[PDB]
Design a protein around this ligand. Sequence first.
Ligand code: ANP
Ligand code: ANP
Ligand code: ANP
Ligand code: ANP
Ligand code: ANP
Ligand code: K
Ligand code: K
Ligand code: K
Ligand code: K
Ligand code: K
Ligand code: K
Ligand code: K
Ligand code: K
Ligand code: K
Ligand code: MG
Ligand code: MG
Ligand code: MG
Ligand code: MG
Ligand code: MG
Lengths: 235, 235, 235, 235, 235
Amino acid sequence: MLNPKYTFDTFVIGSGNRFAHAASLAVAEAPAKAYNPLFIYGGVGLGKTHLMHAIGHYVIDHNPSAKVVYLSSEKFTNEFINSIRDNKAVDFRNRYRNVDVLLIDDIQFLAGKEQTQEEFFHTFNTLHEESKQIVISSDRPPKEIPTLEDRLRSRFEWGLITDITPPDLETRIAILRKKAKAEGLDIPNEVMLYIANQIDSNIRELEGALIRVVAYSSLINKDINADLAAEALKD
Amino acid sequence: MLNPKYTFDTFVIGSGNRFAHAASLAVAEAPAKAYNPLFIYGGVGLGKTHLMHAIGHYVIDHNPSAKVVYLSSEKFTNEFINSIRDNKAVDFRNRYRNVDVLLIDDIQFLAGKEQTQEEFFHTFNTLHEESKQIVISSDRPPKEIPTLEDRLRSRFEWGLITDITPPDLETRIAILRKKAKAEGLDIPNEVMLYIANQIDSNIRELEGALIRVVAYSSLINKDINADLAAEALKD
Amino acid sequence: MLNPKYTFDTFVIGSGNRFAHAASLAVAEAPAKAYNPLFIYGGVGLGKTHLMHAIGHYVIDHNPSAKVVYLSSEKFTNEFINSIRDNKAVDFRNRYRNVDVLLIDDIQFLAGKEQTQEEFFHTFNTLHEESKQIVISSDRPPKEIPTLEDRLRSRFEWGLITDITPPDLETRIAILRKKAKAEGLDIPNEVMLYIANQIDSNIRELEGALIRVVAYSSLINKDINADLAAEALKD
Amino acid sequence: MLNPKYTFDTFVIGSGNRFAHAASLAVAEAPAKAYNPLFIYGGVGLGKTHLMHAIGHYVIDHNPSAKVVYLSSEKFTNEFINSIRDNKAVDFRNRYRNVDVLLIDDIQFLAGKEQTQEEFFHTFNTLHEESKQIVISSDRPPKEIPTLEDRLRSRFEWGLITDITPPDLETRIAILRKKAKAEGLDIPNEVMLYIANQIDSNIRELEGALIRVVAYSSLINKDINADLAAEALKD
Amino acid sequence: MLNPKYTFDTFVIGSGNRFAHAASLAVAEAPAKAYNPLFIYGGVGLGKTHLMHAIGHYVIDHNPSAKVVYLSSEKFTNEFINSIRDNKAVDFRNRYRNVDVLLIDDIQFLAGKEQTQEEFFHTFNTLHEESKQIVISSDRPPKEIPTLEDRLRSRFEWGLITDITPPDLETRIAILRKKAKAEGLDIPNEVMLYIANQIDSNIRELEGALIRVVAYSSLINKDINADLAAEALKD
Ligand SMILES: Nc1ncnc2c1ncn2[C@@H]1O[C@H](COP(=O)(O)OP(=O)(O)NP(=O)(O)O)[C@@H](O)[C@H]1O
Ligand SMILES: Nc1ncnc2c1ncn2[C@@H]1O[C@H](COP(=O)(O)OP(=O)(O)NP(=O)(O)O)[C@@H](O)[C@H]1O
Ligand SMILES: Nc1ncnc2c1ncn2[C@@H]1O[C@H](COP(=O)(O)OP(=O)(O)NP(=O)(O)O)[C@@H](O)[C@H]1O
Ligand SMILES: Nc1ncnc2c1ncn2[C@@H]1O[C@H](COP(=O)(O)OP(=O)(O)NP(=O)(O)O)[C@@H](O)[C@H]1O
Ligand SMILES: Nc1ncnc2c1ncn2[C@@H]1O[C@H](COP(=O)(O)OP(=O)(O)NP(=O)(O)O)[C@@H](O)[C@H]1O
Ligand SMILES: [K+]
Ligand SMILES: [K+]
Ligand SMILES: [K+]
Ligand SMILES: [K+]
Ligand SMILES: [K+]
Ligand SMILES: [K+]
Ligand SMILES: [K+]
Ligand SMILES: [K+]
Ligand SMILES: [K+]
Ligand SMILES: [Mg+2]
Ligand SMILES: [Mg+2]
Ligand SMILES: [Mg+2]
Ligand SMILES: [Mg+2]
Ligand SMILES: [Mg+2]
């Protein structure tokens, strides 16, 4: 279930993510003991899911008996709605109310879902009173999620809330050198600089702009440089 | 489900398609470990579908367990809309969210299909965060697909993007020669030159010209030469 | 569904239709495995529809388990538009995308019909990719059909195109002789020769001129000869 | 729907209309199995409509399940254009394309109605390939109808064409006697002979002459002879 | 709608209007069953319009269910041209093709209106084929109306034509008597005989003379005598 590229070690710290990283490690090192719940929000492609998976690995790599479960809220909704239609709701509860860490991603996808919101509420309360770790990610802070009840907003606000903001030029370059290290790549700093300057959006667009430049250098079998990089990225 | 005619074998490589060929061979050699997702775009009849079936053919033969699925985005839409009407959404999701390689063709037909775009978003995230191969083809790069949410455009720009451009005279001649050898046809080079020189459009029109010339030869029982070829293609 | 008077047995082969007839029979004997698609074009009354029924009969008679559908693009347009109004698009698609042989007459009636063009595109792609025979006819070649997208034009050009031209004096007579033979009639050669010489337009006008000669004869109850003929066809 | 005065029995056969009569009777006796289509043309007031209603009477009397529709091409035009404005085109098609016999009068009023012509085209084709009788009347041969496409002219010439030419004096007398007999009148021969001699135009003008002679007789309470006829028709 | 003073009860029969009167009553007693159409022609101020209104009143009085419409051809022309501009021709056809009796006055004003002619043709055929009464008035017989097509003039001649000729002295006297009885005046036969002798033209001028003579008498305050009449009309 846990993408194995998404560790603390592959996660680059910058000003924009420092809080969320420190909170995520606090929680990993001391599950249910440090911050419960941890609520992480922020814009598209900024590492929410990466951090959530990093908390996961850390906890498992340190307690092989720990029942650790990641899933988007869309998947939590689908399994729940199913258990009602198939009358096996008792089996959905024995699953999700007895995990040791619950990592639930993108809770904004519960908007306009009266029933799944309620079931998430009862799941949240059970896990909290049983000293289990809850980690929720969102694209926006609890106040800005519509159709949400006070009682549920109130529990999202009860632990630590951290935001993630987009990285600067320097941080984008550090994210580029980190993926390049991961595949043994010798790349000039003028290239990274050039790439990071064009792509100031999400680390996916960024990750992708690098994959291209390299793959192209490989096809034409020529050394990587800002002349090549710019050619590979016109389109 | 896969065309036996569309393999890496029957695919002639030229300057217009070298990138997409290499990318597709890499993806095929290393499912999910090389480029994920791979996104291929280009004009009419230049080998996108062929390259996608080529990836399928190779993976199934280097891993007879792998679940490999090819479909147009229009079939993905129809099957999805159906699954909601006949209240079997769980069966649609069991299939598309649990494949090892998804080959999804002509992604632009999700233009202005808000529900299906969202269903494809979650399908994508499930497969990518579980190291499954996504290959996506389009008639255009992600920045140019209308209605396309920016949430997906980004996921399309996150792996490798390759385009294919129309093959030159030399590659068209080589596509003709390759089709002829496969039907066991002995055809003079001057005829392949004649055909390749008149048809500079798409490879579908190029195959059609050869089929016409062969059929008109067979009908008038005369050996294939450049006078016959010009006679058979006048209209 | 199919005209029992429209078979290979009743189709007269001349230089003007040798190519279309040869193609139609190859398709009929080896469906999906000789030429696919087959595109037949030609002016008014030259046996396009006759040849498409003849392929229907041949395939049905030789494989009773084959799903063979003949229809005009006009009926395809109305059945589609209707399936949309009645929320029954899925019933349409289950029919036209699962046949073994699609015989679709007069595709020029899709000029100006963008929604149905897209629907025929998707039907074409599904049938071709699943090794099903497509046969399309037209009053003109693909490049002369207005409003057609390049992706659809290219699909019409990808198999064998065959044109039909107006039959010569020898073939007109052969056609008159064949109609007469079927209708138990007995007619001097000078009569066929006179009719054959006067009607050089379409086989409809030709059949019609034989029908008036026979009818004028039956009326004034005198036996058929050149003088009666010229009297009958005085127009 | 049909005129009870317009039968084969009430129709006076001359040499100018012998051929239309025979063909009409043949059609009536064997619908869809004798002449299909039957195309009748001729000048004003020579019994085209009479002959069409006569076909309709004969078929309905020998087959109560037969669906027989008589209408002018101008009524076909107004019902079509309305069915488009009122979005009920499928309701018009259900009517006209499933009749057993279609009797359409004065086809020349389709001249300059390119949309209606096309709908009639598709109506013709549907009715023809399902073995339904078509009967068309015109004031002129298919060739002489302006704006008519080739594909439609060709279909009008595919069956039996029959002209009707104005009646001779013997037939004009034979007809005046039929109308007089139909009203139980006793009228001297010299009266018919006088009228038939002064009126050589259309049977409408004949009928109106007899009506004037007879109305004048009854007004001035004197018997009908040549002198009174001559006095009544002075203008 | 209609003139309450134009009845059978106020129409003075004489030898000049005998035939037209008989025919108009014959039609009124037996709508669509005695003469269809009825064509009335004749010079100025001879009671054509009066007869047409009298038919109307009689039909309405004996049948409250009956749809009777009187109008000038000029009102028909204008309402029809208006219907085309306003795209409401369907509304024009609904009105005029579904009446039980159509009284259309002064048909000659259709001369030169080729478009209105055709509309009146089709209207005529529809009313006629559905056994509705058509009454047409004119200043001249059909052959003398210009621009009229053969097929329309034919239909004007298919029924009864009645001419009206100017009235004699006895009838002029009787008309004056009847107008004078209507107003409740004691006018000596000497006066009526003076007016009738001097006014031999149309009954409008005849009515005009009486109105002057009466008004002259009212002003001078002198009983009406034949010398008072001579001076009143002196100019
Ligand atoms: N700080 C970081 N260091 C290294 N890689 C990073 C960092 N932030 C993001 N990435 C990479 O960027 C990609 C997107 O990260 P992800 O964890 O999916 O972001 P997200 O905020 O969860 N996106 P979304 O759900 O669309 O709003 C992954 O490949 C991450 O490893
Ligand atoms: N490089 C090539 N060598 C051999 N055959 C080729 C090549 N490129 C395309 N073809 C053939 O061309 C035809 C069309 O290829 P296909 O892969 O369907 O193109 P496409 O890019 O998918 N077209 P479209 O989906 O309309 O934009 C097939 O018969 C292929 O076999
Ligand atoms: N070669 C032929 N031998 C015998 N009959 C023929 C031949 N060609 C045409 N006909 C007859 O001609 C008539 C019209 O043929 P059909 O196949 O309908 O023409 P088409 O090309 O489909 N015309 P159109 O659809 O108007 O563009 C039918 O009765 C056919 O049987
Ligand atoms: N041969 C005939 N014998 C008897 N009555 C006839 C004959 N021909 C025409 N009539 C009568 O003439 C009148 C008009 O004939 P009809 O059948 O309407 O002619 P038409 O050819 O349709 N006229 P049109 O549409 O203006 O060209 C009717 O009253 C018919 O019954
Ligand atoms: N025979 C009649 N008896 C009494 N009044 C009559 C007679 N003929 C005409 N009139 C009167 O004369 C006037 C004109 O009659 P009207 O019916 O309009 O004539 P017309 O033929 O319609 N004229 P026009 O339309 O100019 O060609 C009205 O007041 C009628 O009542
Ligand atoms: K709740
Ligand atoms: K949708
Ligand atoms: K050669
Ligand atoms: K094939
Ligand atoms: K359409
Ligand atoms: K299309
Ligand atoms: K047409
Ligand atoms: K005439
Ligand atoms: K007219
Ligand atoms: Mg995420
Ligand atoms: Mg493709
Ligand atoms: Mg045809
Ligand atoms: Mg008629
Ligand atoms: Mg008047």
